[PDB]
Swiss-Prot record, chain B:
Widely expressed. Residues 17-147 form the MATH domain. It comes from Homo sapiens. Residues 159-283 form the BTB domain. Residues 57-177 are annotated as: Required for nuclear localization. Residues 172-203, 283-341 are annotated as: Important for homodimerization. Antigen recognized by serum from scleroderma patient. This is Speckle-type POZ protein. The keyword Nucleus applies. Changing residue 107 to Q: In NSDVS1; gain-of-function, reduced BET proteins stability.
Amino acid sequence: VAESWCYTQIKVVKFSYMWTINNFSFCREKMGEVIKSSTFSSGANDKLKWCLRVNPKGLDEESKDYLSLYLLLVSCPKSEVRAKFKFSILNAKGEETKAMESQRAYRFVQGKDWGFKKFIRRDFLLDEANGLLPDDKLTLFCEVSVVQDSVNISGQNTMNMVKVPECRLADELGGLWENSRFTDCCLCVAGQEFQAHKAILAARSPVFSAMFEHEMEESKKNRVEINDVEPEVFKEMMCFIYTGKAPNLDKMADDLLAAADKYALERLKVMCEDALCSNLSVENAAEILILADLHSADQLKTQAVDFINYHASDVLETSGWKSMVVSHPHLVAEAYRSLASAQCPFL
Amino acid sequence: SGPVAESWCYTQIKVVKFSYMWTINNFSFCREKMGEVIKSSTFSSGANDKLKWCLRVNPKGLDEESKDYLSLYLLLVSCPKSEVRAKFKFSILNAKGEETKAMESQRAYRFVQGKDWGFKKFIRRDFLLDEANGLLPDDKLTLFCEVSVVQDSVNISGQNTMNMVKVPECRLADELGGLWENSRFTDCCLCVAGQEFQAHKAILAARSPVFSAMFEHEMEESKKNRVEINDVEPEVFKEMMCFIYTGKAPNLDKMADDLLAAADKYALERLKVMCEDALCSNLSVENAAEILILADLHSADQLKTQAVDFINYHASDVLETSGWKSMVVSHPHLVAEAYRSLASAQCPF
Amino acid sequence: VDFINYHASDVLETSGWKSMVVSHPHLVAEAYRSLASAQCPFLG
Amino acid sequence: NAKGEETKAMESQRAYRFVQGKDWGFKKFIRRDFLLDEANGLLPDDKLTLFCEV
């Protein structure tokens, strides 16, 4: 898992220095209050100025015991100079030990000298048994390292994968219907004249396949005559055939069920039955049952029979019921058989 | 049992969870002191830009109680003021990228801008400073946090059903397939290096712009029936035309190498992207060079970017492979792009 | 090579680099090797 | 019944009068940790599905 890394690497600058006096045993001469060192620098254009002054003799009370070593900031424009100095020895003979260091640093400022007053006692340092006077010389080493806080990273480390656009066949065929490119037949409906591609119609609608497949193209293909259906219902039907979707079906379920049953669109038939099924009011179940019987819509017929059985007490007062009994005895017999063997067999 | 049971009330609790890794090089070299502040980079979820979180740690915890314990918080940087809340966990990693130490806040703290709440006093410093503990590889501290803002406040009263009519699926791709394999009185004669295919004009023209430019222009007058495709092998042209009709290619990963070239030749954007997805999911160091040269050759973009990312990560071993040497001999500018990507991925050094 | 790696974000802009991209590929390959194998990892 | 559980839930042994603005039920069903215990099959996808019959 990964969403954003910010390394913000703390800026670390490091550099070295050395200090050799060839006559340490006799380097006192002037009683050793302080040795003014020659400055040194490094880094960006020698912008940081540094010098190491030593008070080898006893300027203070306890300084007779312990030898001295200090770091002095000769100059720097920025007041805050915080540096982690590591005073030590570059092993003239074999000695890498004996070099303590101060982890804590201090805010060095222009002209200020902050260091430590306590390095090592005089007597055994002067002694040759410890090997601290190689050829009457001694080497020092401060790893003066300065840091500052202006560092950040943004980072994303995004764990991304290639995205496939969703299927566009329905859109790329609807846009073919609305544009009418490379058409091959002209559907005729009630003054309006549509123009459509023979292959997709015959594929989705078997009744369309039947009247093209039988080798009457120039008779039928060029001027196939659909004389029953009206403009907007037929337009919706073609939109279903081409795109597989019926947008404004809910307000036209009746006549579109008729049209869909004509051409055996056995899914648009069920969509029309779904629109009609959740519309059954108490006073229209006669008409909807007449529909479902006439156009062989089985599921709507079953649901309308159940609705009439469950609203019999209300439906029989409606004039539509009287009309349907007048015209369709066998529908009344079917509803009767439906509530004969169910939704009543307790008495 | 009584299944179904009418409604489907399905109240949700939207949980946005995202991760954040915090890593300082040479952590215990200086890292300041006393109270101070190492304010981190503000970070969001990634989805949209409205919530802004950030870590904030002090190697020397503020106040004396947090002297031996590092003081860690988590502050709301900025957001459209709604008093957002979150439950959060802070976890420490190592070089091998496995969780070493992890603490999770028990409850979702309520947050507003300027108000912070976190694992104060989260761990004793001495445990971390233990070099034998192994939690400071290369002197570099690493930290990892997961913020789990939750708002809830979403309910739906199910769907009451109350109807039983079975509209069966959608079948458009299925019978359009029936127009191809059964071939159902097609219109234009295609030919692929000897084979004989019979396909339509309208579906090809709609779903493949190169075909539409091909078919609309001057073959309608003379040679609309016969057009020869002498560029792609028929055993993959069949899957091209089984995408153009039914909008899917089942046996694609067997031959996704050349199908990318075919799809990009005829500007089948969706199939080109599917081929990129099939090539992207089988990358390997032995052939990342070939995939990069391909994804440049056939103008692929996402596969080019992902092959670039893979080669940046696994540059260690690809150079020993012959694919890289062929790539450098043949395609210098690809090496220039990969080198540029690696350079930007390591800008601050 | 070490210099151009350290100044890469500006060196890639220069005309000399854009001439060396064509006139000398293996130099860019070796610069890539020194950037990849002789440095890294950097998070990822 | 995601996994097999048609048991473990109590039943109302007596019919209580329900009035406008009032609530009724019970409160002593199952322990919270036991509920959150996946061994009992009571955290499908960190979701709780209910089968109430009124």
